[PDB]
Amino acid sequence: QDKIIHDIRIQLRKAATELSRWKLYGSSKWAAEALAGLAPQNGFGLSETEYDLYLLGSTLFDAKEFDRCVFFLKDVTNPYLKFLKLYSKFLSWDKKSQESMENILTTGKFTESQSNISSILKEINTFLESYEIKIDDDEADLGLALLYYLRGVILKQEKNISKAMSSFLKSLSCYSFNWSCWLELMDCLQKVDDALLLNNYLYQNFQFKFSENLGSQRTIEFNIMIKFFKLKVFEELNGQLEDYFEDLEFLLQVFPNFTFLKAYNATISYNNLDYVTAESRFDDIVKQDPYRLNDLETYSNILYVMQKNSKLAYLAQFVSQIDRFRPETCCIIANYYSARQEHEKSIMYFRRALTLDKKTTNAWTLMGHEFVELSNSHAAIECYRRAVDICPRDFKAWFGLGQAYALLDMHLYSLYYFQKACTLKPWDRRIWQVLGECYSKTGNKVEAIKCYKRSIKASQTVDQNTSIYYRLAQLYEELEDLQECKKFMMKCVDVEELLEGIVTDETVKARLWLAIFEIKAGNYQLAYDYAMGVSSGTSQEIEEARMLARECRRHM
Amino acid sequence: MGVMYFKKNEFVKAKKYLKKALEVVKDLDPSSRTTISIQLNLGHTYRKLNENEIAIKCFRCVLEKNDKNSEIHCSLGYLYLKTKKLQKAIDHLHKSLYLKPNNSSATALLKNALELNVTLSLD
Amino acid sequence: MIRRAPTTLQLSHDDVTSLIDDLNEQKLKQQLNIE
User: Which residues carry this modification: Phosphoserine (chain C)?
Assistant: First the structure.
């Protein structure tokens, strides 16, 4: 620490004010909030005849009169005042850029297209090419980073992801300590192997502009929120972690009582499916910052699994009391109605929350689940599709499609959808088993076993493996490996001893088949032993086992 | 003329004239149904000529130029199905049927990709 | 004076069906080698 923390305070004060100056609410909100957690430097390149336009442009933007700002700055030769016009020009188009299909679902009304950004993108390229000083060398300043960041997000709109990375990384090199720029960098990955490749780029190829930044900040490893970058990537997708635990500790010692870190830290418990510890960590945040509403839908999601409706209802009452039209408020309320089995009304509030941001967390997927319980099976599959388009890293979106298509007669579609989600979260025990069950329709029995044998290993606890053991024998019966059927269906019989003789229905079929098989093999004494082992179940199995027992005794 | 010479199954003078047209208009007409059309046609000639490699790149650059187009996605899926890259073609197919409702040929090609996915047993 | 859309042609039915048939050939002959 020592002067390192003091050096952060001064420079973080900069990122809080200049970013707020040029109408970037999201980035400045994080930076300003980081001042409170952490335990008037002014300057800009402007002339008196041009400084008025910035006041003119800023105050019209604040009054939310977006379009008139564009006209009043029709010509601006300032290096980075042009960004403010172009930013307003972009958002003016975006609010009316609603896809026709997606709009029917998000509203339910059931009733020039994109050429603007093509001109918007071309303008940025034209301005930069004709600009005096490029990104190279120790030139450039904060203002140029905004232009490149704006250029990057427009590029992501046309799904030019490959070039989008180059623009964003180029903006961050010029100016660091901009949080909103890195959020858009998250959505560019949509894969696991590139993250380490991108990590290699930062460690070797990437370099910072020390001219703008303060001391001990050009270096990548002494930088503080490069850890924030590493923290975010390894929670969205686990993969293989590099220094994840060590750098997390250092960031925890700094930034005391920082609510975002605690919410992130507790979200790890939810990702690890440790609900009991998740509530305790979440609850402390509520006491500290009652009026913070971000990432509160995760709190409702955790409470939904525990089904603590009494606790959940008060959370909805408390959340809705202070604010009634933020996306997390409506999402929590919509989650509440589901607990009351009113799946038909939860869509309404999920619908309302979506119209607020239209790029949220997994609120699209939760909308799809509520349709499934209504047996619509067609709104859900298309509702699930929209979540795929926005965030292709969402496990639940892909799984919902494969699960929904499983109910549908055509199971062949479900294989591909499960395969993609399989790569995203290979650690889940359910997805491997469900993939194998749907994959048996394919008729290629060999690959199912490689999937099936991975399901049992990933299933951890052995008692749930009794059900899938019977599936292994059934598939092996389709091949000339009836002996292999015996050994595995013997294994589930052994698990009965481990499970204190639960003698469930699954082992009832397991025991009777083995007596029948051993009878066919001439081992009457052995088959007689399992004959009395089926002492419970349906009447027919009791009668059949007694017939096997009666038969075995005659041949002894 | 390039289309004309493509129609008579010559596939050499068509390519030459289309390439000449494209080098003439390298500087101007970045969009607006002229660069898109010529590059798409040249890629289609390359596809029929079985030179799929450069076809991949030209179809990709057209796709990144303009993205809402079912024909480009269907042709790229066909190009991938010509090789063995089914993992990177089923997504393009699905996007193509998302963009345009029927696409009967695209539906048949996607169905064939499904039977391939059933047959293959890759890890 | 206005120019209409220039002539562009896409995948016909005959060539895609021929590729379907060839694709069936190659997913039909290899399992004979396996068996």
Answer: 12
